From a paper:
This initial construct crystallized readily but did not diffract well; therefore, we introduced five surface mutations to induce better packing. The longer construct crystallized in a new space group as a tetramer. (b) Tetrameric structure of the long LOR constructs shown the four monomers assembling into a compact sphere. Each monomer is very similar to the short construct with a root-mean-square deviation (RMSD) of 0.5691 Å2 between the most similar chains. According to the PISA server, the average dimer interface of the longer construct is 1810 Å2 with a predicted ΔG of −6 kcal mol−1. At a structural level, the C-terminus of the longer construct forms an alpha helix that penetrates into the active site of the adjacent monomer. One hypothesis is that the C-terminus interacts with the catalytic residues of an adjacent monomer with the enzyme active only in an oligomeric state. In the structure of the long construct, we see electron density at the interface of these loops from two different monomers that sit between Asp 388 sidechains from each monomer and Glu 373 carbonyl backbones from each monomer. We have assigned this density to a magnesium ion which could help neutralize the negative charge from the aspartates.
AASS is a bifunctional enzyme with an N-terminal lysine-2-oxoglutarate reductase (LOR) domain and a C-terminal saccharopine dehydrogenase (SDH) domain, which are homologous to Saccharomyces cerevisiae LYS1 and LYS9, respectively. The LOR domain catalyses the reductive deamination of L-lysine and 2-oxoglutarate into saccharopine (EC 1.5.1.8), which constitutes the first committed, and possibly rate-limiting, step in lysine degradation. The LOR domain itself consists of two lobes, both Rossman folds with a central beta-sheet with alpha helices on the outside. Moreover, AASS is a unique drug target for inborn errors of metabolism such as glutaric aciduria type 1 that arise from deficiencies downstream in the lysine degradation pathway.
Numbering used by the authors:
A (entry chain D): 24 to 330, 340 to 356, 360 to 466
B (entry chain A): 24 to 330, 340 to 356, 361 to 466
Amino acid sequence: AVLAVRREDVNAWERRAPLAPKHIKGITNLGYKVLIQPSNRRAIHDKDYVKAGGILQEDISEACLILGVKRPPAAALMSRKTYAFFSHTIKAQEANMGLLDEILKQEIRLIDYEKMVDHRGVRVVAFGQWAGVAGMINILHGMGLRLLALGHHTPFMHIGMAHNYRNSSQAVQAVRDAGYEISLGLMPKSIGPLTFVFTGTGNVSKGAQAIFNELPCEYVEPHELKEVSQTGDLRKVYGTVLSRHHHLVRKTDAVYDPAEYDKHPERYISRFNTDIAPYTTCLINGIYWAANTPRLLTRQDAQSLLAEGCPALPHKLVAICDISGGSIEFMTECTTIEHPFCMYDADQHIIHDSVEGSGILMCSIDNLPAQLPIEATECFGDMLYPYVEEMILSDATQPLESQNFSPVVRDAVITSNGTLPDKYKYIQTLR
Amino acid sequence: AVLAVRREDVNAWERRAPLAPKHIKGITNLGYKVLIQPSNRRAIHDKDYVKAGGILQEDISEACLILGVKRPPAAALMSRKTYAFFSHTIKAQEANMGLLDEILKQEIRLIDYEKMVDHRGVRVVAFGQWAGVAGMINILHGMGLRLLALGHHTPFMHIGMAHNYRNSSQAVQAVRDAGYEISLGLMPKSIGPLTFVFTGTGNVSKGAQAIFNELPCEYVEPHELKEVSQTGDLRKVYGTVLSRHHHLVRKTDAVYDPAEYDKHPERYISRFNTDIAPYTTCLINGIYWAANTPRLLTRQDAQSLLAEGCPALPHKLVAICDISGSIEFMTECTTIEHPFCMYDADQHIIHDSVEGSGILMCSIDNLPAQLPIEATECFGDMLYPYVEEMILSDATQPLESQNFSPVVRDAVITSNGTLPDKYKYIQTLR
Ligand SMILES: [Mg+2]
């Protein structure tokens, strides 16, 4: 019963860990030995895990359970062990198919965080609200550069990228300082009031709203967005939270039924393109798109939206940041931490790593919580902590049926004893 | 006698102004009318100039003197006026030749800030130390990214670009906070102590040292860098200021004579490549290169410099930042948008990258634009005493009848319709 936290080596920006020092202290209190593989890449220093009771050691062959965040290289895999990380093999991705064979060859039991769900189907291990926190900092930083490219200096120029701040607290202070300048009237008058639209009910939307609340903000209802976009006070920023009933209407009767939409989303359409989009400066998209869910904006909608010293904006919509996705059809490509922003012009072509031109600024980062890795690590570790003890007690050599697993851990096992279970047998047929 | 401050439209990053509101208040106190062309690009808001006494007006045809920072577009030029900006036509630059003839056609008097000098030859109007302040913030930000690409999370990751901060004070707070983490021991042990070398005696070198003083720094002599580079405390950063006598020696006897080096720099060489460079993590170059001054580093010197969970640095030298020809292998310059480039052992430069085994290099032509408010106040303070004589000038009257000081007078490039004798060579140089 020995636990090891492996070093992340997927990419340079993976500074997170599956467990935080306070979680390691709890595991050592239960009587389990925890090995910590040294890593200069992790945002939490090795000395903090030593204080919690972990042992700094390169050789983690002693451990039967190896915890990581992202996929490990094939050569690093140790045979006859239990590994837990994000495999991204659920859709039989070719890149991770070379990894999957080594796990089967080494007779490794693999638990995937993404498959861990409760009885209602909600994932029980995730990074919480921090993707929204990081997304809001980035999009405010991107709007400063985009507005400067259009010729307007704004206080948003004084907000850096999310990864430029030690933690969310230091970023909050920077947001307040830029907000102070806005309340002082340092915004350019010709661009008009700025309106922020938040979509979704998940934790990422609340995290994005938390950063927004540090600005001089006033929340208005969606139907008021038309009014505020023209007569709003320039010493404030305006925000609105989009709910289902605000924009979803039936194709037949334009009626919204909460129970019917959840069971039958194919019968509904979205009025976001005409009711909200023309009066939106910045869209923060947190909607988790499901089967037959209507899209907020289409390529046809973008064509409608895209048409001396102090010029006005060419179009009201400046930027869109998705913090959770198919909701926006013309957002076909994703950005990275290194190149956070791209432009979608009226010619329906994407200019990557640019804030210039007449297009719409777009931001779509797949690993937003990596920009706030310390706070993301504690949040992830809090969710994973209750399931850790049953994972350490697992034995990679014994069959799955003899293991004392809960349904959350059991259904998440992709590989075990060299062979894929029935529920994941389909992977082999999918290339 | 009407003065106007034109709107900057050279590039998106030109947020500076030739005069600050506090300077406009003094000019209005003298009784002169000041027009302010509205500009969303300016870092200082239009209302602050209105408070100082300026008048917000798009049409500045009433003014006889138009002050800007950088070049205006040719179409915007108003005939029979006096303009003051950086023209960059003294060396007959191809790009600005189309501007220069247009100025001659409009019969405009052009004063160039860079040509304004004192009797000793020192420029009297400049942006001061702020280029060095911005350069130090950027290079610390670049070292965090470069070290992360090498596999090391560092507190330098928590320092942004200069243009991400409202002023130098907010940047100082971030540098202090990263310094706190260094003093707490959060730096990775495997990379070892970090050594910073500052060169030059100009104002920009002093500005970069000011940001460095906010870190947990210990200053050592340049020759001590060899010892500290191995046994230095990992909770401190180490810096040294390079003087002439430390690295400059004559070829024949290895002796340094201050008076002779100034008169005959060709007789001297620099051993910085062997005595200090191998033990330098980050080089901040502020030396102003002269005719026969020896080079600090050569391409062959770079070839000599370029050769499990906690890896060591591939080579001691990580980054070089130029804040001012001293370094030949720095053949290309970077921009604010793409601040860093890598010079590899293959002698090819990969721009906008912090990855690979090369040497990270940063060389921005307009560093003060990242701190435009403080750069505007410094530039305006130097220009303010010469402003009044420019307002009294008349573009239609001959240059010889104008009451100009020698500083302003020699800086007139175009005068009335034809270039003066001192600038006659420009047309023949094309
Ligand atoms: Mg970049």
